[PDB]
Nucleic acid binder design. Structure first.
Ligand SMILES: [Mg+2]
Ligand SMILES: [Mg+2]
Ligand SMILES: [Zn+2]
Ligand SMILES: [Zn+2]
Lengths: 52, 116, 58, 114, 242, 107, 185, 162
RNA sequence: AUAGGUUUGGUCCUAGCCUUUCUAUUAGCUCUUAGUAAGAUUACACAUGCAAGCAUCCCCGUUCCAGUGAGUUCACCCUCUAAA
């Protein structure tokens, strides 16, 4: 039989990476006080979270 | 097809031609296509009226309630239809729409009085 | 409809998720209505679950 | 067959199915048809020979049985030997028509008028 | 006191309309098929005859005079926020294969602050739309017109008339009973009863005439027949009913 | 738990040169859609005759295990229902031969 | 003449046939074997009679209507309740559909003669014991007039919650009014 | 015609004409008899004529055919529990054993009627299924709305043209 | 398959090929109005336009929808067993 080993290897590698070298909140959950943006994505935030 | 937690969700499904809107409530998944695979079929929906109106709607509660208790969710139009039929309490969105219509009618009456 | 890895038509990135204004009395009335309606819906769901359990037992 | 159609129209038969099997020889086919028409067991003669009446349960009418022929004297009081699973050599076409298994590009298509 | 299911009354009614294995089991212009022949003895012939007699007996059975229905006047819920806003009246019902049509819940969300259970006509219409029963056309048939009704009466074939009247409307509808009484009155004009001998007649004609005391035609028919004991029994039944 | 499909099975024994096992097939009768006649159809199957009591060409029953403990095996020989040659008659418990009684009945 | 109901029993129609069928006199010319499954679409060609005239499209005094009982009964097997097929009829398909519709209308009117069987009642029982047909006691709110759950209607909440929401929705408010006016001409 | 002796033995209609329906218990059906021995006419006629019917009534149950295996033929069955149902037909008629099995192991009329009612319930005649499984796919083919915009154009209230 | 043409100076027997009917298209021409289904044929490469953000900052659609018929017994039935 020809099992799908490359797919399982890639899945395991990606899981191990995303679980071990996960980016800390300081990198992705950061907030820019000049435009209210979150690094690692480059998107804005709701309007009800401005003055906060 | 293995969906991302495709839980049962009673949703609507088209079934008419161009210039002929027709729908049909069906107990399908939350991610399956509109006219795709489904488990059980419920009473079809008749949107367009006819001679003295014939807005007919039916439901098979014996199995609908069973599938609901089996872990199935409901959509917004499903809740609207349930409220229009009387099974579930009147949807609050319908009451808000009725209040907005009453306010619009009051504004129209005010405008008509201002016409003079 | 967009499979993440796509040319993503850059036509929606120029908008602000602004929430329209709201009234006080109407908003509170609607909040109470939603709370009571959700309570009733949960009660009906619990009743249906109890009926299904009784049927399974029988 | 159209020749058989004309023969039936001349004889009097209105409509009757017939599978024209085998080769299509006009002379031999007509001779065989005449021989078959001349060799036929009627109802009255069969009843007089055997004795039993003609029992039937027509589907068009109701279950009320109507005798078609009766003997000319005696009457076999004993019933026929109702031996199930008899040895009636039926044709494969009969089974194909009963089970609807027959399929072709000219099975039972619409024919001309008249 | 009336006793519609009385043994003697039912026996006299069955006597009025003989079995008739030839008229009741009459062929109809429908699909044809090649009959089948067999050869049996006389005992099997007698068994077939008595089986056909039992089938003919099972044939007649209906119908009873269920009178006119009553319009259902029961409201489920109501609303004060609407009260005339969304007209057209939305109809809603419930499906239950294990429940007859006489125990449904066809709700109709009307614009006014109410929620009735629909009438009987709309109920039957919705039932036919959801559960198409044999016959019962959605729209009223044109045969029930005055001119068409007169033409049908002139055909001298009131059997098919009653058959269509029973297949179209329900046995409890008002128009159904009205058309049935009209047909019975038409049959009353110019005495004749040999036509309604292989169909429903004992429950719609004889019983109705006994209730209305219109036993003149029945008495004339009995006198034309031959029986006298049956006439005395009918007189006794009439005296008992009144 | 109970993953096997075919539970109770009674086939003919053929393969026996194996350890605590034996091959078995069932001479079933499948229907033909065109000929409408049944023919002698058979398919080989694996059994778990832990004792190898049965021989070649006999009739024995096999008990399907709840879960197949290997790749192809999924049954287990329970007992010899009918030993060919030394078969016992259902009625009149006595041996029998080719349409003859090895030991006379009445006992 | 003009909706033919007297000419059907005339002398010319009886001499032309009398007892023979009118659909059999028309023969179909075609290729070898059997003609196509479809006949001519229309009797005429939007003006005059083109091609082999139909069995009815040859005289102006041969109209069709619900009153044409004998005509419709003779042009179709009145003794067999089975409609033929287009090759058997061998007529302008337009007139074929017209005759089918006319026969249906005659059957729905009562002029045509044919066996009409009956059916069984809609329900084995003829009682009205269920609540859906016997009675339905109302609720206290139904008798009081106000619908169930009075909080559905207008209910001016206390000013404290309104001030709290205004604090939540500072520079984003609208003009609210009293209860919903129930006027609408 | 058919190239066999008794063509009526295999005609589908003759097979569907049966009646016996083994309950959900019997797992194997073994039969054996002596053909040369004319004493076993009942068993011979059975194995010859009724076996196709039994196999058509339920192909899941196992059926094994054997010949010379004992002086006195017999019909040995096997239940789902482990027991056996031994019914003899030697010197008897096939109809006798047929009625016996129908009354013992055959599915009573109650179970058949219940299964028929369940199947009818599954055959929902109200839903607008895709013909193959139900009837009337769309409301345009039945009374309730315009009878198909193709068969007749829609009224002036058609969407879009406004 | 209810049928026809066909080997010869002629007939009988066997049998080949084609015609007769319905579907998919367009080479040709020709097409009054209006209505309805569908408009890939290329698993070759694509200009571009557009198709999915609500939202007190978080889950969440992006892992669906919409297409392909290259490859292709991965679909139906039973048991086990987490996500709802
Ligand atoms: Mg030549
Ligand atoms: Mg491929
Ligand atoms: Zn014309
Ligand atoms: Zn349509």
């Amino acid at each position: 039989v020809r099992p799908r080993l490359i797919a399982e290897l890639a899945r395991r590698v990606r899981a191990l990476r995303e679980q071990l070298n996960r980016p800390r909140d300081s990198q992705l959950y950061a907030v820019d006080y000049e435009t209210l943006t979150r690094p690692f994505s480059g998107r804005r935030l709701p309007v009800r979270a401005w003055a906060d | 097809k293995a969906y991302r937690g495709g839980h049962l969700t009673i949703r609507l499904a088209l079934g008419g031609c161009t210039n002929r809107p027709f729908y049909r409530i069906v107990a399908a998944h939350n991610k399956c296509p509109r006219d795709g695979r489904f488990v059980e079929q419920l009473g079809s929906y008749d949107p367009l009226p006819n001679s003295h109106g014939e807005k007919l709607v039916a439901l098979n509660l014996d199995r609908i309630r069973h599938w609901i208790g089996c872990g199935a969710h409901l959509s917004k139009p499903m809740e609207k239809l349930l409220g229009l039929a009387g099974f579930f309490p009147l949807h609050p969105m319908m009451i808000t729409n009725a209040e907005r219509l009453r306010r619009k009618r009051a504004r129209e009456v005010l405008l008509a009085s201002q016409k003079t | 409809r967009k499979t993440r890895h796509d040319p993503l038509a850059k036509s929606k990135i120029e908008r602000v998720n602004m929430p329209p204004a709201v009234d006080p009395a109407e908003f509170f009335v609607l909040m109470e209505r939603y709370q009571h309606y959700r309570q009733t819906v949960r009660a009906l769901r619990m009743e249906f679950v109890s009926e299904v359990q009784r049927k399974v037992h029988e | 067959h159209r020749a058989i159609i004309t023969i039936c129209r001349l004889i009097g038969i209105k409509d009757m199915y017939a599978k024209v099997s085998g080769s299509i020889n006009m002379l031999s086919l007509t001779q065989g048809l005449f021989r078959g028409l001349s060799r036929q067991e009627t109802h009255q003669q069969l009843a007089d020979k055997k004795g039993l009446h003609v029992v039937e349960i027509r589907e068009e009418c109701g279950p009320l049985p109507i005798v078609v022929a009766s003997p000319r004297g005696p009457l076999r009081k004993d019933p026929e030997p109702e031996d199930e699973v008899p040895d009636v050599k039926l044709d494969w076409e009969d089974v194909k028509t009963a089970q609807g298994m027959k399929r072709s590009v000219w099975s039972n298509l619409k024919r001309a008028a008249t | 006191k009336p006793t519609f299911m009385d043994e003697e009354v039912q026996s006299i009614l069955t006597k009025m309309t003989g079995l008739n294995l030839q008229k009741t089991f009459k062929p109809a212009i429908q699909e044809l098929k090649p009959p089948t022949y067999k050869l049996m003895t006389q005992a099997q012939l007698e068994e077939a005859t008595r089986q056909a007699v039992e089938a003919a007996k099972v044939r007649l059975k209906m119908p009873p005079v269920l009178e006119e229905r009553v319009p259902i006047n029961d409201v489920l819920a109501e609303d004060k926020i609407l009260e005339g806003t969304e007209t057209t009246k939305y109809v809603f019902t419930d499906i239950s294969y294990s429940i007859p049509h006489r125990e449904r819940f066809i709700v109709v969300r009307e614009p006014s602050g109410t929620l009735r259970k629909a009438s009987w006509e709309e109920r039957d219409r919705m039932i036919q739309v959801y559960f198409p029963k044999e016959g019962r056309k959605i729209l009223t048939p044109i045969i029930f017109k005055e001119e068409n009704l007169r033409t049908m009466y002139s055909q001298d074939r009131h059997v098919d008339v009653l058959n269509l009247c029973f297949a179209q409307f329900e046995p409890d509808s008002t128009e159904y009973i009205k058309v049935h009484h009209k047909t019975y009155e038409d049959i009353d004009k110019r005495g004749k009863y040999d036509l309604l001998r292989s169909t429903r007649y004992f429950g719609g004609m004889v019983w109705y005439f006994v209730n209305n005391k219109k036993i003149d035609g029945l008495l004339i028919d009995q006198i034309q027949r031959d029986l006298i004991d049956d006439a005395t029994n009918l007189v006794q039944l009439y005296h008992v009913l009144h | 738990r109970s993953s096997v499909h075919a539970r109770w099975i009674v086939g003919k024994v053929i393969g026996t040169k194996m350890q605590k096992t034996a091959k078995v097939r069932v001479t079933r009768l499948v229907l033909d859609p065109y000929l409408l006649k049944y023919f002698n159809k058979r398919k080989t199957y694996f059994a778990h005759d832990a004792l190898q009591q049965c021989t070649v060409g006999d009739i024995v029953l096999l008990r399907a295990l709840p879960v197949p403990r290997a790749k192809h095996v999924k049954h287990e020989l329970a007992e010899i229902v009918f030993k060919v040659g030394k078969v016992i008659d259902p009625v009149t418990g006595k041996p029998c031969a080719g349409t003859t009684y090895l030991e006379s009945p009445l006992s | 003449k003009d909706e033919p109901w007297k000419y059907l029993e005339s002398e010319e129609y009886q001499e032309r046939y009398g007892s023979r069928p009118v659909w059999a006199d028309y023969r179909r010319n075609h290729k070898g074997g059997v003609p196509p499954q479809r006949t001519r679409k229309t009797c005429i060609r939007r003006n005059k009679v083109v091609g082999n005239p139909c069995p009815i499209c040859r005289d102006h005094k041969l109209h069709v209507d619900f009153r044409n009982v004998k005509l419709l009964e003779q042009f179709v097997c009145a003794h067999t309740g089975i409609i033929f097929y287009a090759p058997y009829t061998g007529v302008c398909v337009k007139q074929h559909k017209r005759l089918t519709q006319a026969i249906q209308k005659a059957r729905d009117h009562g002029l045509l003669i044919y066996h009409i069987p009956q059916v069984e009642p809609r329900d084995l029982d003829f009682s009205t014991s269920h609540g859906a047909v016997s009675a339905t006691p109302p609720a206290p709110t139904l008798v009081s007039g106000d619908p169930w759950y009075p909080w559905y209607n207008w209910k001016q909440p206390p000013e404290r919650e309104l001030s709290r929401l205004r604090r939540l929705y500072q520079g984003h408010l609208q003009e609210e009014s009293g209860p919903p006016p129930e006027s609408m001409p | 015609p058919m190239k066999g002796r008794f063509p009526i033995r295999r005609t589908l209609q003759y097979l569907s004409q049966g009646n016996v329906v083994f309950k959900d218990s019997v797992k194997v059906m073994t039969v054996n008899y002596n053909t040369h021995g004319e004493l076993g006419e009942g068993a011979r006629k059975f194995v010859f004529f009724n076996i196709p019917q039994i196999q058509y009534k339920n192909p899941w149950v196992q059926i094994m055919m054997f010949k010379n295996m004992t002086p006195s033929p017999f019909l040995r069955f096997y239940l789902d529990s482990g027991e056996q149902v031994l019914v003899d037909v030697e010197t008897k008629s096939n109809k006798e054993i047929m009625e016996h099995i129908r009354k013992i192991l055959g599915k009573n009329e109650e179970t058949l009627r219940e299964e028929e009612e369940e199947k009818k319930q599954l055959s929902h005649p109200a839903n607008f299924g895709p013909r193959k499984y139900c009837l009337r796919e769309c409301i345009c083919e039945v009374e309730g709305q315009v009878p198909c915009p193709s068969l007749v154009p829609l009224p002036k209230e058609m969407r879009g043209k406004y």
